[PDB]
Write a protein that holds these residues in place. Structure first.
Motif, short mmCIF file in Angstrom:
data_model
loop_
_atom_site.label_atom_id
_atom_site.label_comp_id
_atom_site.label_asym_id
_atom_site.label_seq_id
_atom_site.Cartn_x
_atom_site.Cartn_y
_atom_site.Cartn_z
N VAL A 185 1.97 5.33 7.68
CA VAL A 185 2.30 6.74 7.49
C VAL A 185 2.58 7.03 6.02
N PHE A 186 3.37 6.17 5.37
CA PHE A 186 3.78 6.44 4.00
C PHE A 186 2.59 6.48 3.06
N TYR A 187 1.70 5.50 3.15
CA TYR A 187 0.57 5.47 2.22
C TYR A 187 -0.39 6.62 2.50
N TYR B 94 0.35 9.61 3.77
CA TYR B 94 0.97 10.84 3.27
C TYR B 94 0.94 10.89 1.74
N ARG B 95 1.36 9.81 1.09
CA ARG B 95 1.40 9.80 -0.37
C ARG B 95 0.02 10.06 -0.94
N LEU B 96 -0.99 9.33 -0.47
CA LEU B 96 -2.33 9.51 -1.00
C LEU B 96 -2.78 10.96 -0.84
N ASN C 181 13.53 16.06 0.44
CA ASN C 181 13.37 16.64 -0.89
C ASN C 181 13.82 15.63 -1.94
N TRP C 182 12.95 15.37 -2.91
CA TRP C 182 13.26 14.49 -4.03
C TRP C 182 13.43 15.24 -5.34
N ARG C 183 13.03 16.51 -5.40
CA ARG C 183 13.11 17.31 -6.62
C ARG C 183 13.67 18.68 -6.28
N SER D 66 0.82 -1.20 0.00
CA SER D 66 0.00 0.00 0.00
C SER D 66 0.86 1.26 0.00
N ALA D 67 1.95 1.25 0.77
CA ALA D 67 2.83 2.41 0.80
C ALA D 67 3.43 2.68 -0.58
N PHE D 68 3.84 1.63 -1.29
CA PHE D 68 4.43 1.78 -2.61
C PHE D 68 3.40 1.89 -3.72
C1 LIG Z 1 19.02 -0.11 11.40
C2 LIG Z 1 18.24 0.28 12.66
C3 LIG Z 1 17.13 -0.71 13.04
C4 LIG Z 1 15.86 -0.58 12.20
C5 LIG Z 1 15.90 -1.41 10.90
C6 LIG Z 1 15.08 -0.76 9.78
C7 LIG Z 1 15.75 0.50 9.21
C8 LIG Z 1 14.72 1.53 8.71
C9 LIG Z 1 13.88 0.96 7.55
C10 LIG Z 1 12.80 1.96 7.10
C11 LIG Z 1 12.06 1.46 5.85
C12 LIG Z 1 10.96 2.44 5.44
C13 LIG Z 1 10.39 2.07 4.06
C14 LIG Z 1 9.38 3.11 3.60
C15 LIG Z 1 9.01 2.92 2.12
C16 LIG Z 1 8.12 4.07 1.62
C17 LIG Z 1 7.88 3.92 0.10
C18 LIG Z 1 7.06 5.09 -0.44
O1 LIG Z 1 5.93 5.24 -0.13
O2 LIG Z 1 7.74 5.98 -1.33
C19 LIG Z 1 8.61 6.88 -0.66
C20 LIG Z 1 7.83 7.94 0.11
C21 LIG Z 1 7.85 9.24 -0.69
O3 LIG Z 1 6.89 9.13 -1.73
P1 LIG Z 1 6.63 10.44 -2.71
O4 LIG Z 1 5.43 10.11 -3.58
O5 LIG Z 1 6.60 11.69 -1.87
O6 LIG Z 1 7.96 10.48 -3.71
C22 LIG Z 1 8.55 9.28 -4.14
C23 LIG Z 1 9.80 9.64 -4.95
N1 LIG Z 1 10.56 8.56 -5.56
C24 LIG Z 1 9.67 7.62 -6.23
C25 LIG Z 1 11.49 9.10 -6.52
C26 LIG Z 1 11.30 7.84 -4.54
O7 LIG Z 1 8.36 8.18 1.39
C27 LIG Z 1 9.76 8.34 1.53
O8 LIG Z 1 10.44 8.66 0.62
C28 LIG Z 1 10.35 8.07 2.93
C29 LIG Z 1 11.11 6.74 2.96
C30 LIG Z 1 12.61 6.93 2.69
C31 LIG Z 1 13.34 7.39 3.97
C32 LIG Z 1 13.47 6.26 4.99
C33 LIG Z 1 14.16 6.74 6.28
C34 LIG Z 1 14.26 5.60 7.31
C35 LIG Z 1 14.68 6.14 8.70
C36 LIG Z 1 14.76 4.99 9.74
C37 LIG Z 1 14.80 5.56 11.18
C38 LIG Z 1 14.97 4.44 12.23
C39 LIG Z 1 14.84 5.00 13.66
C40 LIG Z 1 15.46 4.08 14.73
C41 LIG Z 1 14.54 2.97 15.23
C42 LIG Z 1 14.07 2.02 14.13
C43 LIG Z 1 13.65 0.67 14.68
C44 LIG Z 1 12.66 0.79 15.82
#
Ligand SMILES: CCCCCCCCCCCCCCCCCC(=O)OC[C@H](COP(=O)([O-])OCC[N+](C)(C)C)OC(=O)CCCCCCCCCCCCCCCCC
Ligand SMILES: CCCCCCCCCCCCCCCCCC(=O)OC[C@H](COP(=O)([O-])OCC(O)COP(=O)([O-])OC[C@@H](COC(=O)CCCCCCCCCCCCCCCCC)OC(=O)CCCCCCCCCCCCCCCCC)OC(=O)CCCCCCCCCCCCCCCCC
Ligand SMILES: CCCCCCCCCCCCCCCCCC(=O)OC[C@H](COP(=O)([O-])OCC(O)COP(=O)([O-])OC[C@@H](COC(=O)CCCCCCCCCCCCCCCCC)OC(=O)CCCCCCCCCCCCCCCCC)OC(=O)CCCCCCCCCCCCCCCCC
Ligand SMILES: CCCCCCCCCCCCCCCCCC(=O)OC[C@H](COP(=O)([O-])OCC[N+](C)(C)C)OC(=O)CCCCCCCCCCCCCCCCC
Ligand SMILES: CCCCCCCCCCCCCCCCCC(=O)OC[C@H](COP(=O)([O-])OCC[N+](C)(C)C)OC(=O)CCCCCCCCCCCCCCCCC
Ligand SMILES: CCCCCCCCCCCCCCCCCC(=O)OC[C@H](COP(=O)([O-])OCC[N+](C)(C)C)OC(=O)CCCCCCCCCCCCCCCCC
Ligand SMILES: CCCCCCCCCCCCCCCC(=O)OC[C@H](COP(=O)(O)O)OC(=O)CCCCCCCCCCCCCCC
Lengths: 505, 63, 54, 96, 72, 51, 713, 26
Positions: free
Chosen positions: G566-568, G570-572, G681-683, G437-439
């Motif tokens: 949160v991701f889905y 926000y994106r939506l 920021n992505w752009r 859903s997030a992706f």
């Molecule tokens: C290593 C420490 C232990 C924890 C292990 C896990 C590490 C963290 C893993 C986080 C995975 C998150 C995946 C989110 C996928 C979202 C996809 C999506 O909707 O598109 C992107 C959307 C944006 O969508 P958009 O539509 O705005 O733009 C998309 C743009 N493109 C396609 C070009 C990419 O959201 C993001 O970009 C944010 C996700 C990327 C940044 C992730 C930061 C992670 C920070 C981790 C902090 C950990 C705190 C410490 C404690 C943790 C454990 C308790």
């Protein structure tokens, strides 16, 4: 409070309905033969064909009403007879009531009538399915086959003697009489040219099983000189004789009631037969074999394992269910459904006279009505859309909404929804089979109700839905009142027969 | 056979009545009595619920 | 909406129409299939009411 | 095909003879001859093709009389089963 | 918003953009009789309805209403 | 119920409205009575007063 | 022949008859047996006086005698039975019965008329009568018959007729359901209704058609009905100007009633009936676009999965019937513990009876709840119109498995297979659905995968074993999922059936109500801090069990799925509304024309806006009521009929430092993810440097604010 | 504004078969 009046009314109604039908048939035949030098239709409004059609239709219908009354009388009579036997416990008292025959009409074939619930269910199926099929064959009978308007009356008389007789030989003869009228109908009334070969396949395949049953009857009669069907209680067949009899009986009656691998004739005949006669064939003509098998196997004592017969029935069910998917022809798909249901019914009779017979009888009734419904829907599709193939037929619902609705509700009923005798029969059979062999029950249910059901539903849904853009100048209008009420009556029976008295089920 | 099945149906109906009347607290305490023993004693070997045949020896049929 | 058209003025709003069945309303044939099926339904219902219900 | 007679005598067919009119003057040397019969079917006003257009009480009366007969027959049957000439209504009836 | 309206054949009994002038009376004569039928069904079924005791009520174990085991 | 159903059925016929539902009410009043009386008469003990 | 004269004569006769009745009653009381001595005196003068002064009584008695004679004749004619009590001749009978006046001894005309009038008096009906007898059945039957008859008679009921009829029926049903919801949930009221002996299922067995309105049933029934009322009100606007609006409305009503029947089922036969009905009606809703065969493929996929689930459920019911000769739900629940020790001899293995029954039930539940592996049909089921999609995916089609587990909980409490399978599959489904859903890029697909994730969370909650938490999660998810579905439906309709938000941008101004409604609904749906939907996930993590062998995978999947919300969300929200305008120029220009500027201007429907607003308000109120009932210090929920206590409430009432600090890990994970989705920021933009500066300001200000709040005050 | 012509029959395009329907793809 049961009195002798009800007993005599039951017996008189049963005896006299047969003579009502026979006199109607005799008068109609006399008129037909002596009104014209050559017994063919005169293509004018004043033809005797109209009178013969009227006489046949409303002899069958009135005899069906009288049969309803007589069947109800029989139910009361049998219930109260069981109560009379069971209730009294005093050793001095015994139920010995003797009835004297009427002096108005004779006993046909000098035989005292004996009626059972299964036989009367079979007779009711005969009446209703014959009514539907005769209503269907009006467009087929034209100017040289009008003599076949009496085929269903002949079937009714044969079935009446078949189910109201306690004589083994008369039973067998009535069973074997059904071949000639059915073969003649298929041969002379079927429009398709392949019907000529289909009729020969039907004759040969059914006659092989008829010969098997004839051998079994010869074994019984030659060994036991009796014919009363009840003297077999005092004679016991050795193990070898009993196993031979059961094998012959099962194979012979399974030739008629389609079983694997002996359903090639059924598929051919259903595909190439009249749409109105396919209804009668599938609905009724395959269940006389079940009734005969039940009678013979419950009369004979068999000390053999029925695993082989159960395996044959289950293999037939599995084969038909798996093949359902690959049929684009609606009539052939319905034929495979008929094979599946008949094999399940036959499996219901593999435990002698256990409680499985009740589920078998109920499933026979529901299959008769359901097959009649399905073949009638195929008939309507073929007659208004000049094809019964899935590739040539599509989007029926959007041009003929009533027909599409009928197809959808037919599929729902076939799925076995609760509130339907189909569901009740499935419940009976599966409840027994779960304790008999739970893994086999699971396999049978899985296959039949998932794989076969999906294969069956694919073609019907594809035909019902879509967009009929082809041949817009030739699209039909809708179902007629006759077709609509036939469909409604099939649905009404399938729904309301679940309220029938539970004493006999 | 129908009478034994009727015993089973009656005890099942009584269990439903107990469930509706008595709250879940003390329900099992009150069921751990004649009623539970009868439910177990009316199991499939003793009553043919839905099986095709009740496998009974001639002595059992006579009884 | 911006440019909605009323039913009284919309020329493509349909009033109930169509033929219920394929039978011709004005047919000169003394056809009896419909009467036969209606009789079957009525007699079945009457038998249930007068012999079975209750 | 159909061989029944169209011209029935039980009743006169409804018709309108004014919708189509046959030309009877001013012909040309290339025009075909007119048609002799130009009557069209006329339906009764307020006829709705999308329902049964049934206005009789026969079916309702038959069903109601059947239901009433069934009720009284059941009453008599219950009295007979209880061995009484008529039902003995109790002072209180409970759920069951 | 919706699709553009297109002609529907008169002979065909279909629901495309069907609006009835007498819908008010049709609704009136389809609602109340249905309500009466449901009322009859409801009062018929209430005879076979079961409810647990109220707040201040306890079921006497020896009362007839209390469940009874089968007596062999 | 029967009287009001007859009157409303007449009105529905006059105004060209469906009336099979009023017909169903009239027909089902005796049927509902039959079902209710039979249920009461049967010696079946649901959750409730014992026979 | 005057109406006034007839009325006056009738009134005079009525008064005379009433006076004669009173006089006869008094004389009869005085002369119980001696009244004849004066009434039938041989004196001619006295006889004439009595007849003249009691003529109304005498004529009434004569009419009664004639009617009774004819009625007795009719009964004898019809029943071939007896005589008129005796064989009295007509003259003797009529004279005797007319002379006899004792029939009026207890009869008073005014009293009888008053009784007839007060019979229909509605003042009498009381709450106590309603509490004794449930009127829920009367309204549900009304809704069902309305839908059926409306389907049959489409020509009679135009668009408006169908809408109004079904609206009235559904409103009455919902109001009655609302009235009984308070009693069932808290006052310990539940009903077991029986309609009759449905069918015979054995040589002497006959199952009745019974309904069980309990807490478990009402929890699903009220939610489904409340969502359906507003979905029904909204559909008339969503399918506005469509060829077939009545068909869609009636399909929705059919699916609602099917689900209501399923949830409020008194025995396994009714449960199976409702199961098949929801399957069939969902098939029809998915295949609504019958002209297209592409839709038929998705419909057939759903149909195949539903038939598989039906097979599993039927086999489980058959096993139950074979074991116990009973199909009653209450009896099965209270008996299963006795047979727990039993085993079933299958082909070559001796399987535990509870394990096999629970295996089949869980299989069918997973198929209908769209768990991992069996969820393949749910993404394809989005071909249905948005109202149908919302109804099926909120609390109607995807919660059937949850209802099954809740209703048959006593079975699964003794199931080893359930213990091992529910948490693992639930957590895996939660993680999978959340991340997909997030992706996701399509609105309906995003909502479908979010529904899959929330169903996984519901499975995990049931595994924890706090039925109150499961019910709360179900209610929250259903309400807010339905509301979000309606909002995205409005967005799609504005965007001309393009459901992908890659072509959506700057819709906040064109759909002002949708933007704010979606904001509220999404923050509640996606469990976020300081929202009504945070507590459901908090309670799930409170109740999560730790004795599992696959606990590492289960917990990691649960954490990932929980954060994925949160991701889905926000994106939506952002992509639909506040992103740069990506849609076709026509979408914006057609609506930006100055001619359209008016007090009536709107790109949505006023009825749709009101329906969404009322749905949100009622969902908030109901969720608050449930939270007060369950999570309050005083526990006031009705009995759940389960004897399994999980101890999970201990960490909700008196949590320890360990758990209190453990929850902070997830809280801060969500915080970091929020910061990422906001400040990342992505752009390239004119505001890149100022955005970094704002992030620095926020960090430093947060630190100083925390310092002052904790220490400096 | 513009008076649009009635919805095109082209919206549903008739499909003409150009390949054999193999029985192996039934
Ligand atoms: C290593 C420490 C232990 C924890 C292990 C896990 C590490 C963290 C893993 C986080 C995975 C998150 C995946 C989110 C996928 C979202 C996809 C999506 O909707 O598109 C992107 C959307 C944006 O969508 P958009 O539509 O705005 O733009 C998309 C743009 N493109 C396609 C070009 C990419 O959201 C993001 O970009 C944010 C996700 C990327 C940044 C992730 C930061 C992670 C920070 C981790 C902090 C950990 C705190 C410490 C404690 C943790 C454990 C308790
Ligand atoms: C086009 C059809 C195509 C079919 C083929 C395709 C099939 C498959 C696809 C199907 C889908 C497509 C077709 C559907 C669209 C059709 C469109 C169309 O034609 O529109 C016109 C069509 C007809 O209306 P119309 O053309 O405007 O006017 C017709 C006349 O004016 C009416 O004249 P009238 O006012 O004089 O009425 C005559 C009579 C109607 O006459 C008949 O129909 C004769 C029936 C003879 C008996 C046959 C068996 C009946 C079995 C039960 C079902 C009853 C019929 C209802 C229809 C089926 C159910 C939906 O009406 C009644 O009196 C009704 C009472 C019937 C009860 C009889 C019971 C007999 C015993 C049954 C067994 C025992 C029961 C015990 C019960 C105990 C207590 C619970 O539209 C409708 O009105 C639809 C009605 C649908 C049924 C609801 C109304 C009746 C309710 C009866 C009581 C049950 C309800 C609850 C009662 C509770 C208290 C007991
Ligand atoms: C999931 C699958 C779902 C599938 C279904 C989906 C939904 C489908 C919806 C659409 C289709 C169904 C609903 C619409 C049906 C059509 C309704 C309609 O209005 O059509 C108009 C339709 C066409 O109208 P028409 O072209 O004018 O034809 C008129 C008829 O020919 C005849 O009309 P008539 O006006 O000439 O009336 C004739 C009537 C004549 O009526 C009368 O005679 C009654 C009034 C006289 C009473 C006696 C008085 C005697 C003393 C004289 C008193 C003074 C004179 C009083 C009378 C004055 C005149 C009124 O005669 C009878 O009815 C004979 C019946 C006799 C046997 C049964 C009743 C008696 C039982 C025993 C009684 C014992 C006690 C009484 C003893 C009496 C002394 C012995 O006419 C009818 O309604 C005829 C009835 C049959 C219609 C078809 C029924 C189809 C039912 C399908 C059910 C499917 C169930 C599926 C369930 C599935 C569950 C899973
Ligand atoms: C030794 C005795 C030998 C007895 C042999 C019996 C001879 C039978 C001769 C049949 C002649 C049929 C044509 C008669 C003239 C019809 C004139 C006409 O159409 O005007 C309408 C008139 C009257 O029509 P109506 O408009 O008054 O309608 C009411 C009809 N009745 C009177 C029956 C209630 O005649 C008829 O309608 C009679 C129809 C006769 C055909 C019936 C066909 C159904 C099946 C029965 C056929 C007979 C077989 C025997 C009975 C069944 C078995 C027990
Ligand atoms: C399926 C084949 C294709 C379809 C056509 C159907 C043809 C076959 C029909 C079934 C025939 C019976 C087969 C099972 C026999 C079981 C009993 C048995 O034989 O066991 C040894 C039996 C049973 O023995 P037992 O060990 O159980 O007990 C007795 C033991 N003693 C004798 C030692 C005390 O022993 C015998 O007595 C031998 C009998 C042999 C009989 C074989 C010939 C039968 C002829 C009549 C039927 C012919 C039909 C032909 C139809 C046309 C064919 C084209
Ligand atoms: C005694 C108690 C009450 C007795 C009542 C018994 C009712 C029995 C069932 C009646 C079903 C009536 C179906 C009518 C269908 C009419 C056509 C239509 O809708 O459009 C077809 C549409 C379009 O039709 P169309 O617009 O082309 O044509 C309409 C007009 N005709 C048909 C006359 C030409 O086509 C389809 O796509 C098929 C859709 C079928 C949808 C069926 C849904 C049924 C849902 C019922 C739910 C009930 C819940 C029960 C819960 C309790 C269970 C115990
Ligand atoms: C809190 C619920 C809110 C929602 C309520 C929605 C409406 C529900 C339907 C109304 C209540 C019906 C149950 C009555 C229970 C009862 O008997 O309650 C009992 C009272 C009498 O009190 P007692 O029986 O205790 O003495 O019943 C009556 O007074 C009967 C009078 C009629 C009541 C309404 C009937 C509605 C059915 C359709 C009528 C159609 C009339 C003709 C139209 C042309």
């Amino acid at each position: 409070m049961f009195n002798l009046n009800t007993i005599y009314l039951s017996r008189i109604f049963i005896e006299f309905n047969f003579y009502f039908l026979f006199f109607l048939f005799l008068i109609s035949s006399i008129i037909f033969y002596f009104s014209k030098i050559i017994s063919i239709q005169n293509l004018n409004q004043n033809s005797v064909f109209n009178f013969l059609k009227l006489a046949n239709i409303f002899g069958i219908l009135i005899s069906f009403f009288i049969h309803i009354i007589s069947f109800w009388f029989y139910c009361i009579y049998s219930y109260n007879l069981s109560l009379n036997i069971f209730s009294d416990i005093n050793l001095y008292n015994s139920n010995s009531i003797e009835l004297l025959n009427n002096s108005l009409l004779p006993n046909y074939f000098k035989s005292n009538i004996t009626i059972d619930f299964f036989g009367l269910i079979l007779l009711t199926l005969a009446y209703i399915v014959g009514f539907v099929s005769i209503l269907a064959l009006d467009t087929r009978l034209y100017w040289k086959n009008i003599k076949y308007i009496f085929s269903f009356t002949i079937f009714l008389l044969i079935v009446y003697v078949y189910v109201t007789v306690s004589n083994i030989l008369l039973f067998f003869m009535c069973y074997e009489l059904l071949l000639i009228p059915s073969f003649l109908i298929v041969y002379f009334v079927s429009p398709s040219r392949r019907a000529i070969q289909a009729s020969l396949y039907f004759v040969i395949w059914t006659q092989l099983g008829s010969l098997l049953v004839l051998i079994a009857i010869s074994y019984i009669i030659s060994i036991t000189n009796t014919y009363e069907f009840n003297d077999l209680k005092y004679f016991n067949f050795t193990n070898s004789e009993s196993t031979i009899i059961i094998f012959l009986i099962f194979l012979g009656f399974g030739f008629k009631a389609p079983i694997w691998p002996f359903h090639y004739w059924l598929t051919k005949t259903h595909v190439e037969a009249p749409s109105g006669f396919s209804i009668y064939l599938s609905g009724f003509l395959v269940k006389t074999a079940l009734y005969g098998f039940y009678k013979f196997n419950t009369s004979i004592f068999i000390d053999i394992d029925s695993s082989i017969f159960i395996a044959i029935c289950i293999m037939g069910v599995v084969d038909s269910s798996l093949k359902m998917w690959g049929q684009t022809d609606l009539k052939k798909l319905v034929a495979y459904g008929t094979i599946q249901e008949m094999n399940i019914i036959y499996l219901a009779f593999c435990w002698g006279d256990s409680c499985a017979i009740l589920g078998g009888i109920l499933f026979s009734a529901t299959h008769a009505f359901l097959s009649a419904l399905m073949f009638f829907l195929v008939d309507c599709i073929y007659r208004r859309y000049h094809t019964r193939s899935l590739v040539e037929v599509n989007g029926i619902l959007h041009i003929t909404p009533n027909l599409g609705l009928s197809i959808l509700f037919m599929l729902v009923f076939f799925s076995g929804i609760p509130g339907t005798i189909k569901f009740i029969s499935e419940f009976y059979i599966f409840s027994g089979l779960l304790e008999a062999s739970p893994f086999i029950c699971f396999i049978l249910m899985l296959v039949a109700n998932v794989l076969g059901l999906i294969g069956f539903s694919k073609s019907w849904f594809n035909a019902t839905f879509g967009m009929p853009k082809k041949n817009t100048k030739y699209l039909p209008m809708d179902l007629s009142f006759k077709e609509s009420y036939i469909i409604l009556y099939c649905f009404f029976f399938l729904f309301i027969f679940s309220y029938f008295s539970s004493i006999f089920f | 056979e129908l009478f034994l099945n009727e015993y089973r149906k009656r005890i099942n109906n009584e269990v439903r009545r107990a469930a509706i009347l008595t709250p879940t607290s003390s329900l099992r305490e009150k069921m751990n009595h004649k009623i539970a023993d009868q439910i177990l004693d009316l199991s499939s070997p003793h009553v043919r619920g839905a099986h095709f045949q009740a496998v009974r020896s001639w002595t059992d049929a006579s009884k | 909406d911006a440019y909605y058209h009323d039913d009284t003025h919309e020329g493509l709003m349909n009033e109930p129409h169509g033929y219920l069945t394929m039978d011709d309303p004005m047919d000169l044939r003394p056809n009896y299939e419909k009467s036969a099926l209606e009789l079957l339904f009525l007699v079945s219902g009457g038998a249930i009411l007068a012999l079975m219900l209750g | 095909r159909q061989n029944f007679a169209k011209n029935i005598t039980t009743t006169d067919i409804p018709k309108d003879s004014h919708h189509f009119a046959a030309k009877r003057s001013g012909f040309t040397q290339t025009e075909q001859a007119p048609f002799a019969y130009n009557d069209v079917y006329q339906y009764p006003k307020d006829y709705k093709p999308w329902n049964y257009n049934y206005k009789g009480n026969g079916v309702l009366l038959a069903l109601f009389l059947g239901s009433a007969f069934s009720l009284v027959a059941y009453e008599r049957s219950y009295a007979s089963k209880t061995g009484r000439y008529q039902r003995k209504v109790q002072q209180n009836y409970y759920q069951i | 918003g919706g699709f553009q309206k297109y002609p529907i054949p008169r002979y065909l009994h279909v629901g495309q953009w069907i609006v009835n002038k007498n819908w008010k009376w049709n609704t009136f004569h389809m609602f109340f009789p249905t309500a009466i039928l449901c009322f009859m069904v409801w009062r018929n079924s209430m005879i076979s309805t079961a409810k647990p005791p109220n707040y201040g009520e306890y079921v006497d174990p020896q009362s007839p209403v209390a469940p009874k085991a089968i007596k062999y | 119920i029967i009287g009001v159903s007859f009157l409303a059925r007449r009105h529905a016929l006059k105004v060209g409205a469906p009336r099979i539902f009023w017909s169903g009410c009239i027909v089902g009043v005796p049927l509902a009575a039959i079902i209710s009386r039979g249920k009461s008469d049967q010696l079946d003990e649901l959750v409730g007063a014992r026979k | 022949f005057n109406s006034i004269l007839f009325l006056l004569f009738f009134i005079v006769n009525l008064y005379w008859f009433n006076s004669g009745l009173i006089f006869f009653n008094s004389v009869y009381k005085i002369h119980h047996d001696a009244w004849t001595l004066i009434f039938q005196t041989d004196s001619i003068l006295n006889k004439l006086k009595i007849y003249f002064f009691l003529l109304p009584l005498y004529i009434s008695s004569f009419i009664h005698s004639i009617s009774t004679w004819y009625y007795n004749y009719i009964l004898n004619f019809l029943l071939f039975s007896e005589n008129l009590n005796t064989n009295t001749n007509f003259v003797d009978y009529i004279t005797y019965n007319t002379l006899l006046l004792s029939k009026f001894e207890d009869f008073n005309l005014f009293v009888y008329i008053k009784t007839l009038l007060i019979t229909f008096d509605i003042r009498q009906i009381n709450l106590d009568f309603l509490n004794e007898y449930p009127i829920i059945l009367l309204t549900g039957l009304l809704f069902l018959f309305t839908t059926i008859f409306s389907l049959i008679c489409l020509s009679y009921l135009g668009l408006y007729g169908v809408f109004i009829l079904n609206l009235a029926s559904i409103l009455l049903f919902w109001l009655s359901m609302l009235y009984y919801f308070n009693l069932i949930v808290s006052e310990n009221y539940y009903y077991y209704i029986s309609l009759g002996k449905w069918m015979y299922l054995s040589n002497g067995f006959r199952v009745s058609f019974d309904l069980l309105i309990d807490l478990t049933s009402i929890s699903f029934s009220f939610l489904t009905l409340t969502i359906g009322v507003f979905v029904y009100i909204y559909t008339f606007s969503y399918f506005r100007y469509e060829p077939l609006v009545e068909r869609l409305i009636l399909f929705l009503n059919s699916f609602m009633i099917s689900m209501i029947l399923l949830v409020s089922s008194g025995n396994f036969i009714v449960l199976f009936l409702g199961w098949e009905l929801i399957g069939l009606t969902s098939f029809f809703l998915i295949n609504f676009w019958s002209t297209r065969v592409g839709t038929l493929k998705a419909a057939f996929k759903a149909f195949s999965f539903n038939k598989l689930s039906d097979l599993f459920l039927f086999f489980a019911i058959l096993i139950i019937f074979s074991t116990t000769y009973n199909l009653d739900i209450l009896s099965f629940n209270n008996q299963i513990y006795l047979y727990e020790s039993y085993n079933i001899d299958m082909f070559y293995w001796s399987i535990n009876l509870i394990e096999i029954i629970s295996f089949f039930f869980i299989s069918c539940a997973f198929i209908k709840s769209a768990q991992f592996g069996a969820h393949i049909w749910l993404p394809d089921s989005m071909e249905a119109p948005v109202p149908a999609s919302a109804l099926i995916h909120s609390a109607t089609l995807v919660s059937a498995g949850i209802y099954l587990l809740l209703r048959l909980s006593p079975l699964f409490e003794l199931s080893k297979y359930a213990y091992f399978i529910l948490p693992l599959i639930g957590s895996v489904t939660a993680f999978y659905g959340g991340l997909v859903s997030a992706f996701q890029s399509d609105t309906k697909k995003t909502l479908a995968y979010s529904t899959i994730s929330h169903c996984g969370f519901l499975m995990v909650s049931y595994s924890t074993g706090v039925l109150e938490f499961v019910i709360l999660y179900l209610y929250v998810h259903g309400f807010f999922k339905a509301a979000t579905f309606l909002c995205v439906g409005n967005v799609n309709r504005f965007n001309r059936n393009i459901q992908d938000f890659k072509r959506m941008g700057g819709f906040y101004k064109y759909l002002p109500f949708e933007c704010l409604a979606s904001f509220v609904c999404m923050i509640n749906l996606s469990g976020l801090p300081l929202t009504l939907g945070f507590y459901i996930k908090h309670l799930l993590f409170i109740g999560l069990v730790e004795s599992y062998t696959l606990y590492p995978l289960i917990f990691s999947s649960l954490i990932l799925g929980a954060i994925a919300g949160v991701f889905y969300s926000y994106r939506l929200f952002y992509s639909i509304f506040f992103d740069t305008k990506k849609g076709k120029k026509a979408i914006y220009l057609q609506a930006s024309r100055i001619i359209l500027n008016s007090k009536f201007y709107s790109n949505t429907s006023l009825a749709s806006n009101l329906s969404i607003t009322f749905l949100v308000l009622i969902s908030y109120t109901v969720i608050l009521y449930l939270y007060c009932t369950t999570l309050n210090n005083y526990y006031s929920l009705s009995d759940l009929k389960s004897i399994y206590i999980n101890n999970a409430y201990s960490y909700f009432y008196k949590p320890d430092y360990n758990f209190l600090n453990a929850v902070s890990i997830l809280n801060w994970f969500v915080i970091i993810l929020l910061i990422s989705v906001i400040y990342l920021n992505w752009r390239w933009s004119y505001y890149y440097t100022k955005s970094i500066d704002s992030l620095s300001k926020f960090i430093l200000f947060s630190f100083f604010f925390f310092i002052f709040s904790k220490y400096i005050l | 504004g513009w008076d649009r012509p009635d919805v095109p029959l082209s919206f549903n395009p008739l499909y003409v078969h150009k390949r054999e329907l193999s029985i192996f793809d039934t």
